[PDB]
């Protein structure tokens, strides 16, 4: 508690993610929409937009 | 306005003991990385303090 | 927990003394490091050993 300012005790919580072609399990909060066919439409298949 | 300049030469410089002398935060450098100061070496080292 | 001179030490493409043995981050990765001050959160009256 009487130590210098240059070596004060700190704390770290790491939240490292990863980007793989594995089956995605954890996502954000979103909503699902039913399928459409033969139409020019924007899609959001598992975060792969286009 | 009257900073003292100390010329350091003809010795072996171990830069790993600088952190144990002063309680600073970042080893701010411009041309040489602080982790690569030991494998290579220079001609003369000067210290300006103010 | 970490020391004060270790927030910038743990980074991709960085070396030192902590990154050799204690905690090493990969050079190409996603996600990140959350750090703060916990000086009073890690100050026993006799100190931490």
Short mmCIF file of N, CA and C in Angstrom, two decimals:
data_model
loop_
_atom_site.label_atom_id
_atom_site.label_comp_id
_atom_site.label_asym_id
_atom_site.label_seq_id
_atom_site.Cartn_x
_atom_site.Cartn_y
_atom_site.Cartn_z
N UNK A 1 0.80 -1.23 0.00
CA UNK A 1 0.00 0.00 0.00
C UNK A 1 0.83 1.27 0.00
N UNK A 2 2.10 1.21 0.40
CA UNK A 2 3.00 2.36 0.38
C UNK A 2 4.00 2.28 -0.77
N UNK A 3 3.70 1.47 -1.78
CA UNK A 3 4.61 1.29 -2.90
C UNK A 3 4.50 2.47 -3.87
N UNK A 4 5.39 2.48 -4.86
CA UNK A 4 5.40 3.53 -5.85
C UNK A 4 4.25 3.42 -6.83
N UNK A 5 4.07 4.50 -7.60
CA UNK A 5 2.97 4.55 -8.56
C UNK A 5 3.27 3.72 -9.81
N UNK A 6 4.55 3.43 -10.08
CA UNK A 6 4.90 2.73 -11.31
C UNK A 6 4.65 1.24 -11.30
N UNK A 7 4.39 0.66 -10.14
CA UNK A 7 4.14 -0.78 -10.01
C UNK A 7 2.95 -1.03 -9.11
N UNK A 8 1.87 -0.28 -9.33
CA UNK A 8 0.64 -0.49 -8.59
C UNK A 8 -0.03 -1.79 -9.03
N UNK A 9 -0.73 -2.47 -8.12
CA UNK A 9 -1.45 -3.69 -8.51
C UNK A 9 -2.65 -3.37 -9.39
N UNK A 10 -2.73 -4.03 -10.54
CA UNK A 10 -3.83 -3.89 -11.48
C UNK A 10 -4.52 -5.24 -11.66
N UNK A 11 -5.55 -5.27 -12.51
CA UNK A 11 -6.32 -6.49 -12.76
C UNK A 11 -6.73 -6.55 -14.22
N UNK A 12 -6.80 -7.77 -14.76
CA UNK A 12 -7.09 -8.00 -16.17
C UNK A 12 -8.14 -9.11 -16.30
N UNK A 13 -9.21 -8.83 -17.04
CA UNK A 13 -10.13 -9.86 -17.51
C UNK A 13 -10.08 -9.86 -19.04
N UNK A 14 -9.68 -10.99 -19.62
CA UNK A 14 -9.54 -11.13 -21.07
C UNK A 14 -10.83 -11.70 -21.63
N UNK A 15 -11.28 -11.16 -22.76
CA UNK A 15 -12.44 -11.70 -23.46
C UNK A 15 -12.10 -12.01 -24.91
N UNK A 16 -11.03 -12.76 -25.15
CA UNK A 16 -10.61 -13.02 -26.52
C UNK A 16 -11.58 -13.95 -27.23
N UNK A 17 -11.97 -13.56 -28.45
CA UNK A 17 -12.85 -14.34 -29.30
C UNK A 17 -12.01 -15.04 -30.36
N UNK A 18 -12.68 -15.70 -31.30
CA UNK A 18 -12.00 -16.34 -32.42
C UNK A 18 -12.94 -16.39 -33.61
N UNK A 19 -12.37 -16.34 -34.80
CA UNK A 19 -13.12 -16.39 -36.05
C UNK A 19 -12.72 -17.67 -36.78
N UNK A 20 -13.63 -18.63 -36.83
CA UNK A 20 -13.40 -19.92 -37.47
C UNK A 20 -14.59 -20.27 -38.35
N UNK A 21 -14.40 -21.27 -39.21
CA UNK A 21 -15.50 -21.85 -39.98
C UNK A 21 -16.18 -22.99 -39.25
N UNK A 22 -15.95 -23.12 -37.94
CA UNK A 22 -16.63 -24.09 -37.11
C UNK A 22 -18.10 -23.71 -36.97
N UNK A 23 -18.97 -24.68 -36.62
CA UNK A 23 -20.38 -24.34 -36.33
C UNK A 23 -20.51 -23.36 -35.18
N UNK A 24 -21.05 -22.18 -35.49
CA UNK A 24 -21.12 -21.10 -34.53
C UNK A 24 -22.18 -21.40 -33.47
N UNK A 25 -21.81 -21.24 -32.21
CA UNK A 25 -22.70 -21.51 -31.09
C UNK A 25 -23.16 -20.25 -30.38
N UNK A 26 -22.24 -19.36 -30.05
CA UNK A 26 -22.55 -18.13 -29.33
C UNK A 26 -22.71 -17.00 -30.34
N UNK A 27 -23.79 -16.23 -30.19
CA UNK A 27 -24.09 -15.11 -31.07
C UNK A 27 -24.49 -13.93 -30.20
N UNK A 28 -25.01 -12.89 -30.82
CA UNK A 28 -25.60 -11.78 -30.11
C UNK A 28 -27.08 -11.99 -29.91
N UNK A 29 -27.79 -10.96 -29.43
CA UNK A 29 -29.26 -11.00 -29.47
C UNK A 29 -29.83 -10.44 -30.77
N UNK A 30 -30.52 -11.28 -31.54
CA UNK A 30 -31.14 -10.84 -32.79
C UNK A 30 -32.50 -11.51 -32.92
N UNK A 31 -33.09 -11.40 -34.11
CA UNK A 31 -34.39 -11.97 -34.41
C UNK A 31 -34.28 -12.77 -35.70
N UNK A 32 -35.08 -13.83 -35.80
CA UNK A 32 -35.09 -14.68 -36.98
C UNK A 32 -36.25 -14.31 -37.90
N UNK A 33 -36.01 -14.44 -39.20
CA UNK A 33 -36.97 -14.08 -40.23
C UNK A 33 -37.12 -15.25 -41.19
N UNK A 34 -38.35 -15.51 -41.64
CA UNK A 34 -38.64 -16.66 -42.49
C UNK A 34 -38.00 -16.50 -43.87
N UNK A 35 -37.94 -17.61 -44.60
CA UNK A 35 -37.23 -17.66 -45.87
C UNK A 35 -37.99 -16.93 -46.97
N UNK A 36 -37.22 -16.40 -47.93
CA UNK A 36 -37.75 -15.85 -49.17
C UNK A 36 -36.99 -16.50 -50.32
N UNK A 37 -37.63 -16.55 -51.48
CA UNK A 37 -37.06 -17.24 -52.63
C UNK A 37 -37.22 -16.39 -53.87
N UNK A 38 -36.21 -16.46 -54.75
CA UNK A 38 -36.19 -15.84 -56.08
C UNK A 38 -36.37 -14.32 -56.02
N UNK A 39 -35.84 -13.70 -54.97
CA UNK A 39 -35.97 -12.26 -54.79
C UNK A 39 -34.62 -11.67 -54.41
N UNK A 40 -34.33 -10.49 -54.95
CA UNK A 40 -33.13 -9.76 -54.56
C UNK A 40 -33.32 -9.22 -53.15
N UNK A 41 -32.60 -9.81 -52.20
CA UNK A 41 -32.84 -9.58 -50.78
C UNK A 41 -31.50 -9.56 -50.05
N UNK A 42 -31.38 -8.70 -49.04
CA UNK A 42 -30.22 -8.72 -48.16
C UNK A 42 -30.38 -9.83 -47.13
N UNK A 43 -29.30 -10.58 -46.90
CA UNK A 43 -29.33 -11.69 -45.97
C UNK A 43 -28.31 -11.50 -44.86
N UNK A 44 -28.55 -12.18 -43.74
CA UNK A 44 -27.72 -12.11 -42.54
C UNK A 44 -27.48 -13.51 -41.98
N UNK A 45 -27.06 -14.44 -42.83
CA UNK A 45 -26.87 -15.84 -42.44
C UNK A 45 -25.68 -15.94 -41.49
N UNK A 46 -25.97 -16.03 -40.19
CA UNK A 46 -24.97 -16.22 -39.12
C UNK A 46 -23.92 -15.10 -39.10
N UNK A 47 -24.32 -13.88 -39.44
CA UNK A 47 -23.40 -12.77 -39.51
C UNK A 47 -22.70 -12.59 -40.84
N UNK A 48 -22.93 -13.47 -41.80
CA UNK A 48 -22.37 -13.35 -43.14
C UNK A 48 -23.36 -12.54 -43.97
N UNK A 49 -23.12 -11.24 -44.09
CA UNK A 49 -24.04 -10.35 -44.77
C UNK A 49 -23.72 -10.28 -46.27
N UNK A 50 -24.65 -9.70 -47.01
CA UNK A 50 -24.50 -9.59 -48.45
C UNK A 50 -25.83 -9.24 -49.09
N UNK B 1 16.37 24.87 -17.76
CA UNK B 1 17.27 25.80 -18.42
C UNK B 1 18.74 25.46 -18.20
N UNK B 2 19.04 24.60 -17.22
CA UNK B 2 20.41 24.23 -16.87
C UNK B 2 20.50 22.72 -16.68
N UNK B 3 19.99 21.98 -17.66
CA UNK B 3 19.96 20.52 -17.59
C UNK B 3 21.36 19.93 -17.69
N UNK B 4 21.62 18.91 -16.87
CA UNK B 4 22.93 18.29 -16.78
C UNK B 4 23.02 17.12 -17.75
N UNK B 5 24.10 17.07 -18.52
CA UNK B 5 24.33 16.03 -19.51
C UNK B 5 25.47 15.13 -19.03
N UNK B 6 25.19 13.84 -18.90
CA UNK B 6 26.18 12.86 -18.45
C UNK B 6 26.48 11.90 -19.59
N UNK B 7 27.75 11.81 -19.97
CA UNK B 7 28.18 10.96 -21.07
C UNK B 7 28.52 9.58 -20.53
N UNK B 8 27.89 8.55 -21.10
CA UNK B 8 28.07 7.17 -20.68
C UNK B 8 28.70 6.40 -21.83
N UNK B 9 29.88 5.85 -21.59
CA UNK B 9 30.60 5.13 -22.63
C UNK B 9 31.57 4.16 -21.96
N UNK B 10 32.06 3.21 -22.77
CA UNK B 10 33.03 2.18 -22.37
C UNK B 10 32.52 1.34 -21.19
N UNK B 11 31.31 0.80 -21.33
CA UNK B 11 30.74 -0.07 -20.32
C UNK B 11 29.80 -1.05 -21.00
N UNK B 12 29.11 -1.86 -20.20
CA UNK B 12 28.12 -2.81 -20.69
C UNK B 12 26.77 -2.39 -20.12
N UNK B 13 25.83 -2.11 -21.01
CA UNK B 13 24.54 -1.54 -20.62
C UNK B 13 23.49 -2.64 -20.56
N UNK B 14 22.93 -2.86 -19.38
CA UNK B 14 21.80 -3.77 -19.19
C UNK B 14 20.57 -2.92 -18.91
N UNK B 15 19.67 -2.85 -19.89
CA UNK B 15 18.52 -1.97 -19.82
C UNK B 15 17.33 -2.60 -19.12
N UNK B 16 17.48 -3.81 -18.59
CA UNK B 16 16.42 -4.46 -17.84
C UNK B 16 16.31 -3.97 -16.41
N UNK B 17 17.30 -3.22 -15.92
CA UNK B 17 17.31 -2.74 -14.54
C UNK B 17 16.80 -1.31 -14.43
N UNK B 18 16.41 -0.69 -15.55
CA UNK B 18 15.87 0.67 -15.51
C UNK B 18 14.51 0.70 -14.83
N UNK B 19 13.71 -0.36 -15.02
CA UNK B 19 12.37 -0.42 -14.46
C UNK B 19 12.39 -0.54 -12.94
N UNK B 20 13.47 -1.07 -12.37
CA UNK B 20 13.59 -1.21 -10.93
C UNK B 20 14.13 0.05 -10.25
N UNK B 21 14.49 1.08 -11.01
CA UNK B 21 15.04 2.30 -10.44
C UNK B 21 14.02 3.43 -10.33
N UNK B 22 13.19 3.62 -11.36
CA UNK B 22 12.21 4.69 -11.36
C UNK B 22 10.81 4.14 -11.59
N UNK B 23 9.80 4.68 -10.92
CA UNK B 23 8.42 4.16 -11.09
C UNK B 23 7.67 4.84 -12.23
N UNK B 24 8.15 4.63 -13.45
CA UNK B 24 7.50 5.19 -14.63
C UNK B 24 6.53 4.18 -15.23
N UNK B 25 5.76 4.64 -16.22
CA UNK B 25 4.72 3.83 -16.84
C UNK B 25 5.17 3.22 -18.16
N UNK B 26 5.58 4.06 -19.11
CA UNK B 26 5.90 3.62 -20.46
C UNK B 26 7.32 4.03 -20.81
N UNK B 27 8.05 3.11 -21.45
CA UNK B 27 9.40 3.38 -21.96
C UNK B 27 9.26 3.95 -23.37
N UNK B 28 8.93 5.24 -23.43
CA UNK B 28 8.61 5.90 -24.70
C UNK B 28 9.89 6.12 -25.50
N UNK B 29 9.97 5.50 -26.68
CA UNK B 29 11.10 5.64 -27.58
C UNK B 29 10.60 5.96 -28.98
N UNK B 30 11.52 6.36 -29.85
CA UNK B 30 11.18 6.79 -31.20
C UNK B 30 11.81 5.93 -32.28
N UNK B 31 13.08 5.54 -32.12
CA UNK B 31 13.76 4.82 -33.17
C UNK B 31 14.11 3.38 -32.87
N UNK B 32 14.27 3.05 -31.59
CA UNK B 32 14.67 1.72 -31.16
C UNK B 32 13.61 1.19 -30.21
N UNK B 33 13.16 -0.05 -30.43
CA UNK B 33 12.20 -0.66 -29.53
C UNK B 33 12.86 -0.96 -28.18
N UNK B 34 12.13 -0.81 -27.07
CA UNK B 34 12.75 -1.02 -25.75
C UNK B 34 13.11 -2.46 -25.46
N UNK B 35 12.46 -3.42 -26.12
CA UNK B 35 12.77 -4.82 -25.89
C UNK B 35 13.94 -5.32 -26.73
N UNK B 36 14.45 -4.50 -27.65
CA UNK B 36 15.55 -4.88 -28.52
C UNK B 36 16.80 -4.03 -28.25
N UNK B 37 16.94 -3.52 -27.03
CA UNK B 37 18.06 -2.65 -26.68
C UNK B 37 19.28 -3.42 -26.21
N UNK B 38 19.20 -4.74 -26.12
CA UNK B 38 20.27 -5.55 -25.54
C UNK B 38 21.06 -6.38 -26.54
N UNK B 39 20.44 -6.85 -27.63
CA UNK B 39 21.14 -7.71 -28.58
C UNK B 39 22.11 -6.92 -29.45
N UNK B 40 21.72 -5.73 -29.88
CA UNK B 40 22.54 -4.84 -30.69
C UNK B 40 23.14 -3.74 -29.83
N UNK B 41 24.07 -2.98 -30.41
CA UNK B 41 24.75 -1.97 -29.62
C UNK B 41 25.25 -0.82 -30.48
N UNK B 42 25.57 0.27 -29.79
CA UNK B 42 25.76 1.63 -30.29
C UNK B 42 27.17 2.13 -29.99
N UNK B 43 27.40 3.41 -30.27
CA UNK B 43 28.69 4.05 -30.05
C UNK B 43 28.78 4.71 -28.67
N UNK B 44 27.88 5.65 -28.39
CA UNK B 44 27.87 6.34 -27.11
C UNK B 44 26.43 6.53 -26.64
N UNK B 45 26.26 6.65 -25.33
CA UNK B 45 24.96 6.84 -24.70
C UNK B 45 25.03 8.09 -23.84
N UNK B 46 24.04 8.97 -23.97
CA UNK B 46 24.02 10.23 -23.23
C UNK B 46 22.73 10.32 -22.43
N UNK B 47 22.80 10.94 -21.25
CA UNK B 47 21.65 11.10 -20.37
C UNK B 47 21.44 12.57 -20.05
N UNK B 48 20.26 13.09 -20.39
CA UNK B 48 19.87 14.45 -20.08
C UNK B 48 18.73 14.42 -19.08
N UNK B 49 18.88 15.14 -17.96
CA UNK B 49 17.92 15.10 -16.88
C UNK B 49 17.45 16.51 -16.54
N UNK B 50 16.14 16.71 -16.50
CA UNK B 50 15.55 17.99 -16.15
C UNK B 50 14.14 17.76 -15.63
N UNK C 1 -4.61 -11.23 -12.11
CA UNK C 1 -4.08 -9.94 -11.70
C UNK C 1 -2.76 -9.68 -12.42
N UNK C 2 -2.39 -8.40 -12.51
CA UNK C 2 -1.16 -7.97 -13.17
C UNK C 2 -0.51 -6.86 -12.35
N UNK C 3 0.70 -6.48 -12.75
CA UNK C 3 1.40 -5.34 -12.18
C UNK C 3 1.10 -4.08 -12.99
N UNK C 4 1.64 -2.95 -12.53
CA UNK C 4 1.40 -1.68 -13.20
C UNK C 4 2.07 -1.59 -14.57
N UNK C 5 3.30 -2.07 -14.68
CA UNK C 5 4.04 -2.00 -15.95
C UNK C 5 3.84 -3.26 -16.79
N UNK C 6 2.57 -3.63 -16.97
CA UNK C 6 2.24 -4.88 -17.65
C UNK C 6 1.03 -4.74 -18.57
N UNK C 7 0.31 -3.61 -18.52
CA UNK C 7 -0.83 -3.38 -19.42
C UNK C 7 -0.36 -3.29 -20.87
N UNK C 8 0.72 -2.55 -21.11
CA UNK C 8 1.29 -2.47 -22.45
C UNK C 8 2.23 -3.63 -22.76
N UNK C 9 2.64 -4.39 -21.75
CA UNK C 9 3.57 -5.49 -21.98
C UNK C 9 2.89 -6.68 -22.65
N UNK C 10 1.64 -6.96 -22.27
CA UNK C 10 0.89 -8.07 -22.83
C UNK C 10 0.16 -7.56 -24.07
N UNK C 11 0.76 -7.80 -25.24
CA UNK C 11 0.23 -7.35 -26.52
C UNK C 11 0.70 -8.32 -27.59
N UNK C 12 -0.02 -8.44 -28.70
CA UNK C 12 0.49 -9.23 -29.83
C UNK C 12 1.75 -8.61 -30.42
N UNK C 13 2.72 -9.47 -30.72
CA UNK C 13 4.00 -9.01 -31.22
C UNK C 13 4.83 -8.23 -30.23
N UNK C 14 4.79 -8.60 -28.96
CA UNK C 14 5.58 -7.95 -27.92
C UNK C 14 6.28 -9.01 -27.08
N UNK C 15 7.45 -8.64 -26.57
CA UNK C 15 8.25 -9.49 -25.69
C UNK C 15 8.51 -8.74 -24.38
N UNK C 16 9.39 -9.29 -23.56
CA UNK C 16 9.69 -8.71 -22.27
C UNK C 16 10.17 -9.73 -21.27
N UNK C 17 9.50 -9.80 -20.11
CA UNK C 17 9.80 -10.84 -19.13
C UNK C 17 8.52 -11.58 -18.75
N UNK C 18 7.40 -10.86 -18.69
CA UNK C 18 6.13 -11.49 -18.39
C UNK C 18 5.66 -12.34 -19.56
N UNK C 19 5.80 -11.83 -20.78
CA UNK C 19 5.28 -12.51 -21.96
C UNK C 19 6.04 -13.78 -22.30
N UNK C 20 7.25 -13.96 -21.76
CA UNK C 20 7.99 -15.18 -22.03
C UNK C 20 7.41 -16.37 -21.27
N UNK C 21 6.98 -16.16 -20.02
CA UNK C 21 6.62 -17.27 -19.15
C UNK C 21 5.19 -17.20 -18.63
N UNK C 22 4.74 -16.04 -18.14
CA UNK C 22 3.48 -15.99 -17.41
C UNK C 22 2.28 -16.02 -18.34
N UNK C 23 2.14 -15.02 -19.20
CA UNK C 23 1.00 -14.92 -20.11
C UNK C 23 1.48 -14.40 -21.45
N UNK C 24 1.22 -15.16 -22.51
CA UNK C 24 1.65 -14.80 -23.86
C UNK C 24 0.44 -14.78 -24.78
N UNK C 25 0.25 -13.66 -25.48
CA UNK C 25 -0.81 -13.50 -26.47
C UNK C 25 -0.30 -13.87 -27.86
N UNK C 26 -1.13 -14.50 -28.69
CA UNK C 26 -0.72 -14.77 -30.07
C UNK C 26 -0.68 -13.49 -30.88
N UNK C 27 0.10 -13.53 -31.96
CA UNK C 27 0.33 -12.33 -32.77
C UNK C 27 -0.91 -11.95 -33.57
N UNK C 28 -1.60 -12.93 -34.15
CA UNK C 28 -2.80 -12.68 -34.94
C UNK C 28 -3.98 -13.29 -34.19
N UNK C 29 -4.79 -12.44 -33.57
CA UNK C 29 -5.95 -12.90 -32.82
C UNK C 29 -6.96 -11.78 -32.73
N UNK C 30 -8.20 -12.15 -32.41
CA UNK C 30 -9.28 -11.21 -32.17
C UNK C 30 -9.69 -11.29 -30.71
N UNK C 31 -10.38 -10.25 -30.25
CA UNK C 31 -10.61 -10.08 -28.84
C UNK C 31 -9.49 -9.30 -28.19
N UNK C 32 -9.66 -9.01 -26.90
CA UNK C 32 -8.85 -7.95 -26.32
C UNK C 32 -8.75 -8.05 -24.81
N UNK C 33 -8.09 -7.05 -24.25
CA UNK C 33 -7.66 -7.02 -22.85
C UNK C 33 -8.35 -5.85 -22.17
N UNK C 34 -9.04 -6.13 -21.07
CA UNK C 34 -9.68 -5.11 -20.25
C UNK C 34 -8.86 -4.96 -18.97
N UNK C 35 -8.37 -3.75 -18.71
CA UNK C 35 -7.53 -3.49 -17.54
C UNK C 35 -8.01 -2.22 -16.84
N UNK C 36 -7.68 -2.13 -15.55
CA UNK C 36 -8.09 -1.00 -14.73
C UNK C 36 -7.09 -0.84 -13.58
N UNK C 37 -7.48 -0.06 -12.58
CA UNK C 37 -6.72 0.09 -11.34
C UNK C 37 -7.40 -0.72 -10.24
N UNK C 38 -6.64 -1.60 -9.61
CA UNK C 38 -7.11 -2.38 -8.47
C UNK C 38 -6.08 -2.35 -7.36
N UNK C 39 -5.54 -1.15 -7.11
CA UNK C 39 -4.52 -0.98 -6.07
C UNK C 39 -5.11 -1.21 -4.69
N UNK C 40 -6.28 -0.64 -4.42
CA UNK C 40 -6.96 -0.87 -3.15
C UNK C 40 -7.67 -2.22 -3.10
N UNK C 41 -7.96 -2.81 -4.26
CA UNK C 41 -8.54 -4.14 -4.31
C UNK C 41 -7.52 -5.24 -4.07
N UNK C 42 -6.23 -4.92 -4.10
CA UNK C 42 -5.15 -5.86 -3.84
C UNK C 42 -4.15 -5.26 -2.86
N UNK C 43 -4.65 -4.68 -1.77
CA UNK C 43 -3.78 -4.10 -0.73
C UNK C 43 -4.22 -4.64 0.63
N UNK C 44 -3.64 -5.76 1.03
CA UNK C 44 -3.72 -6.19 2.41
C UNK C 44 -2.82 -5.29 3.27
N UNK C 45 -3.12 -5.17 4.57
CA UNK C 45 -2.23 -4.37 5.45
C UNK C 45 -0.82 -4.92 5.56
N UNK C 46 -0.62 -6.22 5.37
CA UNK C 46 0.72 -6.79 5.33
C UNK C 46 1.28 -6.92 3.92
N UNK C 47 0.46 -6.69 2.90
CA UNK C 47 0.86 -6.83 1.52
C UNK C 47 0.42 -8.16 0.94
N UNK C 48 0.59 -8.28 -0.37
CA UNK C 48 0.21 -9.48 -1.11
C UNK C 48 1.46 -10.25 -1.53
N UNK C 49 1.55 -11.51 -1.10
CA UNK C 49 2.59 -12.41 -1.54
C UNK C 49 2.03 -13.75 -2.02
#
